[PDB]
Amino acid sequence: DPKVIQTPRYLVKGQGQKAKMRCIPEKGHPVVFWYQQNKNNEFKFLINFQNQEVLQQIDMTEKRFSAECPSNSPCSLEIQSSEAGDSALYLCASSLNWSQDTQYFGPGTRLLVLEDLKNVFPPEVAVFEPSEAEISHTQKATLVCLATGFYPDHVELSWWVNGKEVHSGVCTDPQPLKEQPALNDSRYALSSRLRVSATFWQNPRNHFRCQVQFYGLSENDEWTQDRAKPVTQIVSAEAWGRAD
Amino acid sequence: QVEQSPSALSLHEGTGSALRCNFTTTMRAVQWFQQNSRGSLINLFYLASGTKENGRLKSTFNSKESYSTLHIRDAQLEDSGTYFCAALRATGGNNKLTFGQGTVLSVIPDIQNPDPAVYQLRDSKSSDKSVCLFTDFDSQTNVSQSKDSDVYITDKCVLDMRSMDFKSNSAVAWSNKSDFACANAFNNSIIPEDTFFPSP
Amino acid sequence: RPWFLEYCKSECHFYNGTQRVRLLVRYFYNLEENLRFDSDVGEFRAVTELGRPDAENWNSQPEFLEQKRAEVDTVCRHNYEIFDNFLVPRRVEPTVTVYPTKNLLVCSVSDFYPGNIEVRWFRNGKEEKTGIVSTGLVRNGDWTFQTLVMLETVPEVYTCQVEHPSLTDPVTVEWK
Amino acid sequence: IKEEHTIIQAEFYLLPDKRGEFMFDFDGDEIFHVDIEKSETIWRLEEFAKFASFEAQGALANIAVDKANLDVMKERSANVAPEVTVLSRSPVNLGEPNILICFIDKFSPPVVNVTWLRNGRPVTEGVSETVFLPRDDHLFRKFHYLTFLPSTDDFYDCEVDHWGLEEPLRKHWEF
């Protein structure tokens, strides 16, 4: 199956900053598309390529964007001066043909353009151990992870048991909740649960780690404040099994 | 222009339904996507005519009547997501997919042996912090969001312990301080009467 | 002086409107037709060995062929319905004129559309199917036709009759 | 009743001229063509615009794809002289405005140099021109036009130059 690669998954920029996004089309696909998907599930075509050559693009793309598909380098789309209205999921699609067959889309880049980056915050992560009551009543054990106080909602949460990422017995909240809904730039919170059998949790050698990938500022981005630079980072919280 | 319906669809696990797209002009071919929780579009179908079948999915496209459908049978949890139809305007100069409004599809998990309970879970790294877990309730129950604005309640989420073929819904509630207790955590919503409340 | 030409003609053939439609895509390089897509075949077929690589390439792609086979509907029948409003019912009434030359009686039929026409020379009311010299149907290139139907005789009342889809009744011009 | 018609989309790209064309044909007549350099739809008869429309950028894309395909066709692997016929559009009457038709036919590659001549000198006014029209085969045809006022004093020539000609030919016409 065709796989299209897009980086970065999330991206935050201040107004006026360039916003570059990269894409790697499926091997053997000469045709590349770019789309915009906003919060209202509306899709807008931006530009298409045949190999290195731009074939079609809308007016906004020619004036405000700079797209490229060279050899020796991944495809890229770049906003020269980011505005608030640019905030969307930028999708990249490749095709084996010009217009004759299926377009395959990548994971897209969730771009968010803010007025400034003064209110960008990493998450604080804590793991909460299973209750004795649950373990005796159901013979199962639920761990809860809480990522809190982050902004924007550009996080990916994952569970790790004994050094390895697990997917079974897991569910994370479909969307982050506002710690204070009244505020426009309210920091977010996010919960997730990992459920194992009782006999697995009741083992001191079993290690449980909740990892939250946070997308924020880079080393290129300028930071002139007092607190720590809210850069892209991983915040974690751990827990070991208990025989009890 | 593309018209898609329905706008939203809540299908019980193991049941079926159908989505439709009407086109106001001639389309060369139609694509059907499933956009999952991650937000990545999964290709379901490409068809310029007739009917195609792919597992539990089925799709029909008629160029003359300018419409296309997508049938989903035996709904599973992984079927959740927003479904899009997209087509090429045969009269369009710009080579591009024109997308439908989208169908947000939710799959109601079938809980076989419900065991509604609210547990208290302590922080692993601290002695003061803890959360509340309303779990094992069947999918009928809705989890209403808090009103105190000092307490925080997440929406329900279903997890699947695949190896045990087990499924459960849960909602998390926590608060900074201090009057807050688990016995009063999920009382902005209607929880079952036989909910198991342990005595800490 | 070398030159290179990539030439493609996609033909929609209507044998009776949208009742029977055949799509014929023809690819040309320089002076040679190399590739075809007949909707009655359903796949690409090379006309010469130069077109074979494209046939084997595109025929191994199910989605391509599926989109191609649908173009009998999605492009051909789509455009015909539109053209059926103004191109198909287009009617331009012929101008008919008779004048002698050298004898040689000339019936000039000018500026008519469509090309379907019938011109007959009569001698005293009886059709003359002999001695007729014509330039045949002539295309002016601006959606009008002309033709010269000449009779090669020595004269009492010669008559040129013209029948045409733009006419409810035959137009007649006599020459005494 | 029976309606038999043949609608044809005809496009090409030519080297080293680097010129592309795109047109529709109806039963032998041009419906429209797209000006590639200006990205606009040009109808043969103006009235056609009230009934149909075409997004011209669609043709630009095709020519871009044809241009690339031509390079493929070049890596993978003479001229044809034209027939020139000069005739009037309508029967010629003295003092009555008419049009001379210069019909270039059965030629390739699609590139010609036509020069209308009134009394042995070129005419740049009242001259019209068509794009390169399709034939049943692999060759092209072309219509050149000249408005004129019939008189017994004037003689006309249509000079057609093509790569398939050792020498530019001129077809003569007089009343």
């Binding site: 045949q50 | - | 595109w58 789509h78 | 075409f54 894309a61």
Partner: peptide
């Protein structure tokens, strides 16, 4: 209200093959 015409979108052909 003029009806938009449909058209044939050209297709990309690949290399890698040669003839004498």
């Amino acid at each position: 209200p003029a009806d938009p015409l449909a058209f044939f979108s050209s297709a990309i052909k690949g290399g890698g093959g040669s003839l004498v």
